[PDB]
Ligand binder design. Structure first.
Ligand SMILES: [Mg+2]
Ligand SMILES: [Zn+2]
Ligand SMILES: [Zn+2]
Lengths: 99, 89, 76, 50, 51, 1345, 49
C-alpha cells in the first residue's frame, strides 16, 4: 500500500481511504518516542502536524512541495483545536495567552 | 550521496546544530538566495550544504557574518529611498 | 431514602397528596368560581377598561381590526 | 452462627429483605416480594436447568 | 499525639501505614483495632525517628 | 512598542472556571429550539442546534436564502436572514449558548472525588445532593438567631423557624440555594478566622486539617475563580460542525449523540420557562428543575447519573466528557496514534546486494509517495505544461517520469519502521534505490535492530517532507549513523547468522588439507591458490603479511612477518583496513570475536572505515557461506552411543527407590525427590555425553595415523559459531529432551526419554503440549508487560534532557568490579567505560595523577587504568548531578550511536527507557577460595581461641581476596563465630580453605577466658531440666518468654564470665563487665562452674526473579517478608513481651531516649541481645525494602541497590544495559523530598529536591543569612513519580482526564509547555534535539527585555 | 460451563488468612444464578446473580 495526499475525515481532519486508496500509516506513541530519542524535531512536527492533522498545513505544504521549496508553516493541529472547543463547551474556560 | 555526516559533525559539534545550520544553508540555496561553494555532483541542496560544512567554509558564525553583511548591502542601495520619507514630520 | 433517580423523587413527592373526595372536587371548583369571577368584577369596575373596549370597537367598525381579535362571542 | 447474622424473622420479612435486594430502593409490597421470589427459581417460565 | 509506622502484611506482599498514637502499646492496639478486622496481619510498629 | 492586539504566535495556555458573561462571549447567538433541519429542504432551521444565522453558512461564501451568493460580498450580514457570508469552516468554530431558567450545578465539580463545591464550603456531598434534589432546606447567613450557616433543616423545621424568625434568618433549597451559599461566601474573612483558629488550639488532628484547608482557600482566591461560577447560569453549546448531521448513502443520516443530549436539555429548559409563565404548582416546577439538572449532567458527563441512552438505541450516548477522554486506555488523538500522509508499507525482502546506507523501494510505491515532488520537477524542467498535465503524465506513466523520479530520489532519504517499535533504532533512515516488484528490500545487518524476521513481517515507510526533516533523517535517523546500540557500547550492526557461518567456515582450520605446510608471500596469491582449487580454505600455512598499527601519534606504522595462519584467514585479511592488527583475524572468528573486530575498528579507525568494513564483511560472509555448501541432514545430528545404557541404568535407579518405598524404607515425598533427582542426573549424563560425541569426535590423520580435532559437523558449526542453535537446543535434538511438569507446576518423574531425531510417541508429545502452549502464552503476554513497563518509564522520564554543559560537582558514585560471590560477574572496565571521572586518580604510589579530574574515560584511558592496578574510580552520574531540572553533559557520559561525549539537548530519558525496555521481551558450609591471593577482613572484630585459630565475634564480616596486584578478586560473607586458618594480611593458595563454620548453629562464643557462672538461671521458670537420651550428657535448656511460668517470665537468663577468684572478667578494654544472656530454644553446652577459653561456645541456638522482579524494583515495592534494620546505632535489649509482638529497645551508648519497636519475634533473630549494633544493621534476614536503604543507609546506598539488583536480573539473561539509563530512572525516582525543618516553605510538604535545593541554596546566601530549611530525600515508585508534572496538558494524557482537568481548572493553573508530551499534544517543535535551540531562544526572550 | 451445581474452593489470594473458603453455585441453562458462599467467620452467605 501507499499514499501521498488522499481524502480526509470529516469529524477530525485526518487521512482516510475513500476509494480504497489506503489512508496514511498510523503514527503511534512509540513511533513518536523514537523520533523523540533521535531528537528529530521537525520530522516529528511535520509528522503530527502538516502531514496529518493540520487542515491548512497539508495544502500550504503541498504547494511548496511542487514549487521545489521544502519547508513547513505548521500552525495548530485540528485535534487540539477541537479539544479546545470541546473543553470550552463545558463550564471550563481554556485560553491561549501571551505572544 | 553523503554516507556519513561524521566529518561534518567534527567541524561544528553537538550534531543538532549541524542539522539546523546545514538546513539554513540548504535553504539559502534551494530558495535561490545563492549558489554552491563546491562542485555540485548532482547532490541536492541537503548534501551540498553538508559538503560545505565538511570543507569548513560554512557554519553558524560564517553564515551570520554573511547575512549581517547582506543587510548593509541592501541598506546602501536603500540609503536614498528611505531617507526621502522625512515627510513624517 | 432517595435512590437518586428523579423518577422516584417525583413519585414519592406526589404520593404525599391525597385523592380528592367527590365533595372536595365541587368545593374546590366553587372556590375557583368565586376567585375568577371576582377578578372579572374587578375589571368591570375600572372605567378605562370600558373605554378601551369602546375605543377598540371604534377601530373594528373602521376596518382597522377584526372582531375575532377583540372578542369571541357574547354570553351566548 | 448464620442465624445470628440473620436480620429477618418470618417468611414475609425475608421476602421483603430479598425484594429490597433484587430491586433496591423502591417500596416493597407483599404481592411484589411474593411474585419476585416465586418468579425467580420456581417459575416454569423464567427458569430452567434443562 | 506522636506518630509511628505500622507494617501490615498480606497475601502477595506487605506495606507500611501511618498510625497516630501516644504510647507504642497504644499504637499497637490502635493498629490492631484498625487493620485486624480487614485481615491484614500486623508485623511491626516503628516509632518515626524524626532527626 | 505596543504589546499586541490580535493573532500572533502564542505560549502558555491557561485554564479556569467560566463566567456567565465569559460564556456569553464565545456565543454568537442563543439556540432557542431543539430543531435541526427543515426535514424537506435540508437547510438549517434558524435558532436551532444547527443554524446559519448563529453559527455559519452551509456552503462557502454563500448566504442561506441566497440573496448574496458572490465571493465579492463577504463582510456583509444578510438583510433577510442574517447570515454573514464567510467560509463554511467558521461553522466548525463559532459557539453558542443557552440561558438556563433555574441555576444548575456543573456535575464535574459535584461528583469529582475532591468534590469541589463541597470542600469549598466544607459541606459534605451527601448533604449538598440532598439540597439539590429538594429533599431538605439549607440555611445561609444565619445572622444572630438560632441557627448555624451551613446547617440544614427539613420541611416542618424550616416552617417552625420561619414562624419564630421572619427576617434576619435566611434559608433556601435546590440549586439556587447552593449558588447562594457559594456567592455569599467571603474568602478573605474565612481566611482571617482560620488563621486565628489555627493559632489558638494546638493539636495534631486539628491544626493540620486547618492549615491544609486555609491553603486551598487562599489558592482558590489567587486563582481568579469566583465560587458562583461553579453553578451554571449559562450553558455553552458546541459548534455544529463538531457534531455534524451530515448525509449518507441510502438517503439516511448520521449524527453525534451530543445532538440528542443538547436537544433534551433545550426542550426541558423551555418547558421550565413555560411552566414558570403558567404558574404551575411547586411539585411540577421542582420535578422539571430536577429533570433539567439530570439532562445538563448527562450532556456534560453521562454516567454520574442514571446513564441516559440514545434514541432507539440501547448503547448509552457518548457525552462531552467521553468526547474529551477518548478511549483505548488513555490518549487523546495525539498519543495512541494519528494517520499521516506521504507513507506506505509492504512485506519485506532480503537484498544482500545492498549497502548499509540504502534500501530497495518498490517502483510503484516511490511513484505514489513522491507524486507531489514529481509534479514539481516535471513542470520545473518544462516536460509538463501545467500541474494538471503533469498529473496526467504520471497517471499515464510516460517513459520520462521514471528518470524525473530518479532525480528526486537521489539525495532524498526515506524512513523505514517495523511494528513493535521499542528503541529509537525501530525507525531508521535509508537512501531509496528504485526496484521492480512490490516488496521492500532491507539491509540484512539492520535486520537485528528492527527484530525483523523475513517470515512475512511488513515495514512502514515515511517521507521526510520539509528540508529540516531530510537533514534530520540523514544526520540522525540515518542507518549508517547508528551502528551502536544506545543501550551499550557494543555494535548493533554485528553480522547475524549466514555471514558469521561463512566467516567461521573460512577462519576455521583443519589438520591435513591442500597446501598444508607450504609458504606464500601475500594473501593476494593465497586467494589465487584457493580459487584455483590447488589449496584448501582451511590449512595451516606460514605466510607473510603487512599489518599496520596507528601507534605513532596520529600516524600509522607498518611492519611484516611470517605468520602462522590459515589460507582462509589470510584471504579474509584483505578486507581488514589499516590500523587493525593481524591478530584479530587469526582466531576462529565466532559471532562474539567477529563483533569485537568491528568494535575495535570503530574505536580506532573511526566511522567510515567501520561502515565500509561492515559492508564488506557481510558480502564475503554470504559469498563464502554459499561456497561452503553448509547444509543440515538427519544424520548430522548424532545421538550418543551410550544413551540407551544411561537410560537403562537410571531406569534401574527408579526401580531401586521403588523397592525402598515398597518396603517403607523411604517416605512418599523422600522417594519422589530421589526419583526426580536421579532422573535429572540421567538427563545431565546423556546431554554431557552427546555434546562430547558431537564436538571433538571427528578423528583424522596428518602424515601419521591419528590426530583428533574439533568437528566439521554442520549443525555443530552453526551452534559453535553463534550462527544459530545452542547447546541447550541441540540437547533437545540429539539427547533426550528434559522432563515436563503438569499444569500444577510439579515436575513429572517420567521424563522424555526420546528426542526429536527419534519418534516421540503419543504421551511424550501430549505432555510436551502443556509446556508449549504455556510458552507461547508466556512470551505473548510478557510482550505486553514489557510494553507497559516501557510506558511507565518514558512517563517518569520524558522531559529530562541534557541542559547544562557541565554542572561542576565533585559528587559521584564509586565504581568497582561487581565481584559476585566466588568470581567477577562483570569487570571494572565495562562499568567505568564511556563515563567521566569525578576527580584525579592516583597510582598506588602517589604524587602522580594518571587521569586528571573530570575527563571522558575512553578506550585508551580505560586501558591505562588497566595497565596499573586501579581497583575503582569515582564516576559522575545523572543521579548525583547538581544540575536542576535536567542533566549536564559531563555527568551523563559519552554513549550513543557515536563514541563522543553526549550532545547538548539530546533526550536522555526517552533513550534510557527504550533501552531498558527493548530486551524486556527476553526474560523469565564453609568458604573455599578459588584463585590465589591474600586475605582482607573488612569490618571485623575477632579473638584468638585456645586452638590457636581465629574466631569472628562480629555480625557483619567480609572476606576479600587481594591478589599480588593489590586489586580485589573475590568477596565473601563470613558468619559470626567462624574459625579461620588465616587472618588479615596473610597469604593463601588456590583452593586453600580460609573460613570454617556451622550453618545450623549460632554460637554464643566468648571473647575472654574464665569460669562459667549461672546468673538469674532458675529451673522451672527460665530454664528447663532435660538430659540427652543418646549420650547422657545433660544441659539446662533455656525456656523462651512466650512460654515461661509466673515469676520467671520477667527474668532474662545469662552466662556471666568470671574468674578463679569469683570476680568478674570484663569485656576487653571497657568499664562494662562480661555477661552474655541466653535466648529461647537455645540449649546450653557447659554447665555451671565449668572453665572456658576464648572462641569457645557458651551455648548453641538452633534454626523470585524475572521481569516482574524488574517491575517491582523500579516501582520501589516493599517485599513480603522484609528484613528489619536497626533504626539507631547502639546496644539493643528485649522486654515487655506484649501481645505476641516482642519489644525491642535500642539503647544508645552516646545519647539516650532509647527507642522501642514491636517486632513479631515468631521470626528468627539475626542479632544478639547482649551486643552493640551500628545503625542499619541486620536485626533479621530476608529481602530489604528500598525505603529502608534510603532512610537509613543512604542515597548512594539505595541508588546502588536498585542498579545492582536490576542489573542482576538482566545480566543473568545475557543482557547488556549500561548503568547510566537505570541511574537516570533512579534520579527521577527519588526526585521529590519531604521538608522537616521550616523557615521558608511549608512544613510537612512533598516538594521537589530540585526546587528545594534551588530555594535553600538561594537562602544560604543573601535573603536571611541563613533561614534555610532541612528536608528528607524520598523514594517514590516510577508510576508514582510520573504522577507529578507541572504541565496539566501532559497530565491529561496518561492520568484520569476528568479529574486533572477539574483540579487544574479550579486553581487556574497556567501550562507553560516546556516539556515534551505537552508540546507534542499542541503540535509544536519538541523542546529538545533540533528544536531545543528554538525553545531555548524563545524561553530566553520570554521573561526578559 | 454446563448447567448444574458447582463446588469451588477459592483458597490462597482471598483474605490473606489461609483459612481458604468454599463456594457453591447453581447455574441454570436460563434464569438467575444462585450462589452460596462462606467467609472468614464461617458465616454462610447467599446471593442471587
Ligand atoms: Mg517473526
Ligand atoms: Zn440571506
Ligand atoms: Zn552534572
Amino acid at each position: 500500500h501507499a499514499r501521498s495526499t488522499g481524502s480526509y475525515s470529516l469529524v477530525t481532519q485526518q487521512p482516510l481511504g475513500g476509494k480504497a486508496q489506503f489512508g496514511g500509516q498510523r503514527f503511534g506513541e512509540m513511533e513518536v518516542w523514537a523520533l523523540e530519542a533521535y531528537g528529530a524535531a521537525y520530522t516529528l512536527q511535520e509528522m503530527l502536524t502538516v502531514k496529518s492533522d493540520d487542515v491548512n498545513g497539508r495544502t500550504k505544504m503541498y504547494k511548496n512541495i511542487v514549487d521545489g521549496n521544502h519547508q513547513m508553516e505548521p500552525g495548530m493541529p485540528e485535534s487540539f483545536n477541537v479539544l479546545l472547543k470541546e473543553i470550552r463547551s463545558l463550564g471550563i474556560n481554556i485560553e491561549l495567552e501571551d505572544e | 550521496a553523503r554516507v556519513t555526516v561524521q566529518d561534518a559533525v567534527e567541524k561544528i559539534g553537538n550534531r543538532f546544530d549541524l542539522v539546523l545550520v546545514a538546513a539554513r544553508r540548504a535553504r539559502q540555496m534551494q530558495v535561490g538566495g545563492k549558489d554552491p561553494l563546491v562542485p555540485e555532483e548532482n547532490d541536492k541542496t541537503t548534501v551540498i550544504a553538508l559538503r560545505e560544512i565538511e570543507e569548513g567554509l560554512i557554519n553558524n558564525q560564517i553564515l551570520d557574518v554573511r547575512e549581517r553583511q547582506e543587510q548593509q548591502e541592501q541598506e546602501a542601495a536603500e540609503l536614498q529611498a528611505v531617507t526621502a520619507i522625512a515627510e513624517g514630520r | 431514602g432517595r435512590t437518586t433517580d428523579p423518577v422516584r423523587m417525583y413519585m414519592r413527592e406526589m404520593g404525599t397528596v391525597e385523592l380528592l373526595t367527590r365533595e372536595g372536587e365541587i368545593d374546590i371548583a366553587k372556590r375557583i368560581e368565586d376567585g375568577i369571577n371576582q377578578v372579572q368584577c374587578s375589571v368591570a369596575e375600572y372605567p378605562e377598561a370600558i373605554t378601551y373596549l369602546l375605543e377598540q370597537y371604534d377601530r373594528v367598525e373602521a376596518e382597522e381590526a377584526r372582531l375575532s381579535d377583540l372578542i369571541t362571542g357574547f354570553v351566548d | 452462627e448464620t442465624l445470628r447474622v440473620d436480620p429477618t424473622n418470618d417468611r414475609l420479612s425475608a421476602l421483603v429483605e430479598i425484594y429490597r435486594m433484587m430491586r433496591p430502593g423502591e417500596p416493597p409490597t407483599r404481592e411484589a416480594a411474593e411474585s419476585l421470589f416465586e418468579n425467580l427459581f420456581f417459575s416454569e417460565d423464567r427458569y430452567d436447568l434443562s | 499525639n506522636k506518630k509511628f509506622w505500622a507494617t501490615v502484611e498480606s497475601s502477595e506482599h506487605s506495606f507500611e501505614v501511618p498510625i497516630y498514637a501516644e504510647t507504642l502499646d497504644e499504637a499497637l492496639e490502635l493498629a490492631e483495632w484498625q487493620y485486624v478486622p480487614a485481615g491484614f496481619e500486623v508485623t511491626r510498629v516503628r516509632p518515626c525517628v524524626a532527626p | 512598542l505596543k504589546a499586541q492586539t490580535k493573532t500572533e504566535e502564542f505560549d502558555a495556555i491557561k485554564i479556569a472556571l467560566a463566567s456567565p458573561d465569559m460564556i456569553r462571549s464565545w456565543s454568537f447567538g442563543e439556540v432557542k429550539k431543539p430543531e435541526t433541519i427543515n426535514y424537506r429542504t435540508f437547510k438549517p432551521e434558524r435558532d436551532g442546534l444547527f443554524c446559519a444565522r448563529i453559527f455559519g453558512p452551509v456552503k462557502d461564501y454563500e448566504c442561506l436564502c441566497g440573496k448574496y451568493k458572490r465571493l465579492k460580498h463577504r463582510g456583509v450580514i444578510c438583510e433577510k436572514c442574517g447570515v454573514e457570508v464567510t467560509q463554511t469552516k467558521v461553522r466548525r468554530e463559532r459557539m453558542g449558548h443557552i440561558e438556563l431558567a433555574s441555576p444548575t450545578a456543573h456535575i464535574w465539580f459535584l461528583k469529582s472525588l475532591p468534590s469541589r463545591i463541597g470542600l469549598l464550603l466544607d459541606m459534605p456531598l451527601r448533604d449538598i445532593e440532598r439540597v439539590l434534589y429538594f429533599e431538605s432546606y439549607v440555611v445561609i447567613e444565619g445572622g444572630m438567631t438560632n441557627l448555624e450557616r451551613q446547617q440544614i433543616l427539613t420541611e416542618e423545621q424550616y416552617l417552625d423557624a420561619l414562624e419564630e424568625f421572619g427576617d434576619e434568618f435566611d434559608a433556601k433549597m435546590g440549586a439556587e440555594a447552593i449558588q447562594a451559599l457559594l456567592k455569599s461566601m467571603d474568602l478573605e474573612q474565612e481566611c482571617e478566622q482560620l488563621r486565628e483558629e489555627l493559632n489558638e488550639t494546638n493539636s495534631e488532628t486539628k491544626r493540620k486539617k486547618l492549615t491544609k484547608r486555609i491553603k486551598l482557600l487562599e489558592a482558590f482566591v489567587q486563582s481568579g475563580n469566583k465560587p458562583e461560577w461553579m453553578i451554571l447560569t449559562v450553558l455553552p453549546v458546541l459548534p455544529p460542525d463538531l457534531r455534524p448531521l451530515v448525509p449518507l448513502d441510502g438517503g439516511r443520516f448520521a449524527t453525534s449523540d451530543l445532538n440528542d443530549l443538547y436537544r433534551r436539555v433545550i426542550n426541558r429548559n423551555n418547558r421550565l420557562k413555560r411552566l414558570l409563565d403558567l404558574a404551575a404548582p411547586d411539585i411540577i416546577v421542582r420535578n422539571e428543575k430536577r429533570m433539567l439538572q439530570e439532562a445538563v449532567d448527562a450532556l456534560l458527563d453521562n454516567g454520574r447519573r442514571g446513564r441516559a441512552i440514545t434514541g432507539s438505541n440501547k448503547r448509552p450516548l457518548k457525552s462531552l466528557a467521553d468526547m474529551i477522554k477518548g478511549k483505548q486506555g488513555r490518549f487523546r488523538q495525539n498519543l495512541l496514534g494519528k494517520r499521516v500522509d506521504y507513507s506506505g508499507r509492504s512485506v519485506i525482502t532480503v537484498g544482500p546486494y545492498l549497502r548499509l546506507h540504502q534500501c530497495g523501494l518498490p517502483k510503484k510505491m516511490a511513484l505514489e509517495l513522491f507524486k507531489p515532488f514529481i509534479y514539481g520537477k516535471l513542470e520545473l524542467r518544462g516536460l509538463a505544461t501545467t500541474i494538471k498535465a503533469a498529473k496526467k503524465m504520471v497517471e499515464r506513466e510516460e517513459a520520462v517520469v521514471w528518470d524525473i523520479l530518479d532525480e528526486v530520489i537521489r539525495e532524498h532519504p526515506v524512513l523505514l519502521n517495523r511494528a513493535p517499535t521499542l528503541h529509537r533504532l525501530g525507525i531508521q533512515a535509508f537512501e531509496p534505490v528504485l526496484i521492480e516488484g512490490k516488496a521492500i528490500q532491507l539491509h540484512p545487518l539492520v535486520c537485528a535492530a528492527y527484530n525483523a524476521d523475513f517470515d512475512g513481517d511488513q515495514m512502514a515507510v515515511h517521507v521526510p517532507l520539509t528540508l529540516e526533516a531530510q537533514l534530520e533523517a540523514r544526520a540522525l535517523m540515518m542507518s549508517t549513523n547508528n551502528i551502536l546500540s544506545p543501550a551499550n557500547g557494543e555494535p548493533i550492526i554485528v553480522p547475524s547468522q549466514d555471514v558469521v557461518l561463512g566467516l567461521y567456515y573460512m577462519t576455521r582450520d583443519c589438520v591435513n588439507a591442500k597446501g598444508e605446510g607450504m609458504v606464500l608471500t601475500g594473501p593476494k596469491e593465497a586467494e589465487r591458490l584457493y580459487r584455483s582449487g590447488l589449496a584448501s580454505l582451511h590449512a595451516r600455512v606460514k605466510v607473510r603479511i603487512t599489518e599496520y598499527e596507528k601507534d605513532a601519534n596520529g600516524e600509522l606504522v607498518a611492519k611484516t612477518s611470517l605468520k602462522d595462519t590459515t589460507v582462509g584467514r589470510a584471504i579474509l585479511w584483505m578486507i581488514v583496513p589499516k590500523g587493525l592488527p593481524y591478530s584479530i583475524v587469526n582466531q576462529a572468528l565466532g559471532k562474539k570475536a567477529i563483533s569485537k573486530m568491528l568494535n575495535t575498528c570503530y574505536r580506532i579507525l573511526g566511522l567510515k572505515p567501520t561502515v565500509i568494513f561492515a559492508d564488506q564483511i557481510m558480502y564475503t560472509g554470504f559469498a563464502y557461506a554459499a561456497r561452503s555448501g553448509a547444509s543440515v541432514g538427519i544424520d548430522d545430528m548424532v545421538i550418543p552411543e551410550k544413551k540407551h545404557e544411561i537410560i537403562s541404568e537410571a531406569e534401574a535407579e527408579v526401580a531401586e527407590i521403588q523397592e525402598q518405598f515398597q518396603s517403607g524404607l523411604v517416605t512418599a515425598g523422600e522417594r519422589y525427590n530421589k526419583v526426580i533427582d536421579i532422573w535429572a542426573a540421567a538427563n545431565d549424563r546423556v546431554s554431557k555425553a552427546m555434546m562430547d560425541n558431537l564436538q571433538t569426535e571427528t578423528v583424522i590423520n596428518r602424515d601419521g595415523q591419528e590426530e583428533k580435532q574439533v568437528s566439521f559437523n554442520s549443525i555443530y558449526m552453526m551452534a559453535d559459531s553463534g550462527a544459530r542453535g545452542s547447546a541447550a537446543q541441540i540437547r533437545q535434538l540429539a539427547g533426550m529432551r528434559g522432563l515436563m511438569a503438569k499444569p500444577d507446576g510439579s515436575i513429572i518423574e517420567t521424563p522424555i526419554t526420546a528426542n526429536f531425531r527419534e519418534g516421540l510417541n503419543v504421551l511424550q508429545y501430549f505432555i510436551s503440549t502443556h509446556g508449549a502452549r504455556k510458552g507461547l502464552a508466556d512470551t505473548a503476554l510478557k510482550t505486553a508487560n514489557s510494553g507497559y513497563l516501557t510506558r511507565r518509564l518514558v512517563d517518569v522520564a520524558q522531559d529530562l534532557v541534557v541542559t547544562e554543559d557541565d554542572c561542576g560537582t565533585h559528587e559521584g558514585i564509586m565504581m568497582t568490579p561487581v565481584i559476585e560471590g566466588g568470581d567477577v560477574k562483570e569487570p571494572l572496565r565495562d562499568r567505568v567505560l564511556g563515563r567521566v571521572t569525578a576527580e584525579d586518580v592516583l597510582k598506588p604510589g602517589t604524587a602522580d595523577i594518571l587521569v586528571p579530574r573530570n575527563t571522558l574515560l575512553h578506550e585508551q584511558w580505560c586501558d591505562l587504568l588497566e595497565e596499573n592496578s586501579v581497583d575503582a574510580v569515582k564516576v559522575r552520574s545523572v543521579v548525583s548531578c547538581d544540575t536542576d531540572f535536567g542533566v549536564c553533559a559531563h555527568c551523563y557520559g559519552r554513549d550513543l550511536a557515536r563514541g563522543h561525549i553526549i550532545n547538548k539537548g539530546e533526550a536522555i530519558g526517552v533513550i534510557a527507557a527504550q533501552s531498558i525496555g527493548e530486551p524486556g521481551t527476553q526474560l523469565t558450609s564453609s568458604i573455599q577460595v578459588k584463585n590465589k591471593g591474600s586475605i582482607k577482613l573488612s569490618n571485623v572484630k575477632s579473638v584468638v581461641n585456645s586452638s590457636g585459630k581465629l574466631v569472628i565475634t562480629s555480625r557483619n564480616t567480609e572476606l576479600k581476596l587481594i591478589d599480588e596486584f593489590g586489586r580485589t578478586k573475590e568477596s565473601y560473607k563470613v558468619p559470626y563465630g567462624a574459625v579461620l586458618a588465616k587472618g588479615d594480611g596473610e597469604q593463601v593458595a588456590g583452593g586453600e580453605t580460609v573460613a570454617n563454620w556451622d550453618p545450623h548453629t549460632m554460637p554464643v562464643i566468648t571473647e575472654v577466658s574464665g569460669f562459667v557462672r549461672f546468673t538469674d538461671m532458675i529451673d522451672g521458670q527460665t530454664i528447663t531440666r532435660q538430659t540427652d537420651e543418646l549420650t547422657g550428657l545433660s544441659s539446662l535448656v533455656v525456656l523462651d518468654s512466650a512460654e515461661r511460668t509466673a515469676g520467671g517470665k520477667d527474668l532474662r537468663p545469662a552466662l556471666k564470665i568470671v574468674d578463679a577468684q569469683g570476680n568478674d572478667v570484663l569485656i576487653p578494654g571497657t568499664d562494662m563487665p562480661a555477661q552474655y544472656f541466653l535466648p529461647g530454644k537455645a540449649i546450653v553446652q557447659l554447665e555451671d562452674g565449668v572453665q572456658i577459653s576464648s572462641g569457645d561456645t557458651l551455648a548453641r541456638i538452633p534454626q523470585t526473579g524475572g521481569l516482574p522482579r524488574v517491575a517491582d524494583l523500579f516501582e520501589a515495592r516493599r517485599p513480603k517478608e522484609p528484613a528489619i534494620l536497626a533504626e539507631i546505632s547502639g546496644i539493643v535489649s528485649f522486654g515487655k513481651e506484649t501481645k505476641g509482638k516482642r519489644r525491642l529497645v535500642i539503647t544508645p551508648v552516646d545519647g539516650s531516649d532509647p527507642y522501642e519497636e514491636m517486632i513479631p519475634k515468631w521470626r528468627q533473630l539475626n542479632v544478639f541481645e547482649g551486643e552493640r549494633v551500628e545503625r542499619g544493621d541486620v536485626i533479621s534476614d530476608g529481602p530489604e525494602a528500598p525505603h529502608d536503604i534510603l532512610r537509613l543507609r543512604g542515597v548512594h546506598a539505595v541508588t546502588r541497590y536498585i542498579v545492582n539488583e536490576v542489573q542482576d536480573v538482566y545480566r543473568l539473561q545475557g543482557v547488556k544495559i549500561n548503568d547510566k539509563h537505570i541511574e537516570v530512572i533512579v534520579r527521577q525516582m527519588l526526585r521529590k523530598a519531604t521538608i522537616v525543618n521550616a523557615g521558608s516553605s511549608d512544613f510537612l510538604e512533598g516538594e521537589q529536591v530540585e526546587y528545594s535545593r534551588v530555594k535553600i541554596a538561594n537562602r544560604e546566601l543573601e535573603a536571611n543569612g541563613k533561614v534555610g530549611a532541612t528536608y528528607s530525600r524520598d523514594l517514590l515508585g516510577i508510576t508514582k513519580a510520573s504522577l507529578a508534572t507541572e504541565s496539566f496538558i501532559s497530565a491529561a494524557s496518561f492520568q484520569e482526564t476528568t479529574r486533572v482537568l477539574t483540579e487544574a481548572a479550579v486553581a487556574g493553573k497556567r501550562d507553560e509547555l516546556r516539556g515534551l508530551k505537552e508540546n507534542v499534544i499542541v503540535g509544536r517543535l519538541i523542546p529538545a534535539g533540533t528544536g531545543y535551540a528554538y525553545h531555548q531562544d524563545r524561553m530566553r526572550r520570554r521573561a526578559a527585555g | 460451563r454446563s448447567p448444574g451445581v458447582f463446588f469451588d474452593s477459592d483458597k490462597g489470594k482471598t483474605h490473606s488468612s489461609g483459612k481458604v473458603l468454599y463456594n457453591a453455585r447453581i447455574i441454570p441453562y436460563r434464569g438467575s444464578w444462585l450462589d452460596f458462599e462462606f467467609d472468614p467467620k464461617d458465616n454462610l452467605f447467599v446471593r442471587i446473580d
